């Protein structure tokens, strides 16, 4: 039945029905056991697509809102703001969903360095998504929770994973985006991203047959952001 759920998740992925993909992978996470690499990646993909669609919607709607604020479009702004607020409710629910699964199921059952760093990184990510649209105290709270999670993941990563590991590099990339976009700290963002990149360059012999393309891609993404920021 675990195998049955994974197969249902893959069918949903093929069909691009990511809502159903999430439902199937939530059930697997519900079993309170260590997920395989395949299962962690399917769970990550499912939520990344479900939340990604709403974050893209929110950025579009927000750009339209900024356009009308500049034009003085008061009547449209009433509709735009209500619309944005609806999408934020969806975002909050999606984040709370995965954050509850991480807290009750995935983190407690995690028993490898890789899976622990993966789930604390995910925990940092979904608090970061909360912080993207949050205002005032809610933003401070989501940023504090994201920071704590990224620190816990970074502690385990530095002790358990080589600097070339894609989960470690992805963690560095996301944490640097966190410093830049949430904490408003380009200095800290560039330092982390450059440090992670240089540490990988120094130990390229730790690259794995399983993931070297993923590491390469992430290293390129670190370099691209650094290009943007500097």
């Amino acid at each position: 039945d675990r195998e049955d759920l994974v197969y249902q998740a893959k069918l949903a992925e093929q069909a691009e029905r990511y809502d159903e993909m999430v439902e199937s992978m939530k059930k697997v996470a519900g079993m309170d056991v260590e997920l395989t690499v395949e299962e962690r990646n399917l769970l990550s993909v499912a939520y990344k697509n479900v939340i990604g669609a709403r974050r893209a919607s929110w950025r579009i709607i927000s750009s339209i809102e900024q356009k009308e604020e500049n034009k003085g479009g008061e009547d449209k702004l009433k509709m735009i703001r209500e619309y944005r607020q609806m999408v934020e409710t969806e975002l909050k629910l999606i984040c709370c969903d995965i954050l509850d699964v991480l807290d009750k199921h995935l983190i407690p059952a995690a028993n490898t360095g890789e899976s622990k760093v993966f789930y604390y990184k995910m925990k940092g990510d979904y608090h970061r998504y909360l912080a993207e649209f949050a205002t005032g105290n809610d933003r401070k709270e989501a940023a504090e929770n994201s920071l704590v999670a990224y620190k816990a993941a970074s502690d385990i990563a530095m002790t358990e994973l080589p600097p070339t590991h894609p989960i470690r590099l992805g963690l560095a990339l996301n944490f640097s985006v966190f410093y830049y976009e949430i904490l408003n700290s380009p200095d800290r963002a560039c330092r982390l991203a450059k440090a992670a990149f240089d540490d990988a360059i120094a130990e390229l012999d730790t690259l794995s047959e399983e993931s070297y393309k993923d590491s390469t891609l992430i290293m390129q993404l670190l370099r691209d952001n650094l290009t943007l920021w500097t």
Partner: peptide
């Protein structure tokens, strides 16, 4: 536009 991890 920043990129984050896949």
């Amino acid at each position: 536009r920043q990129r984050s991890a896949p």
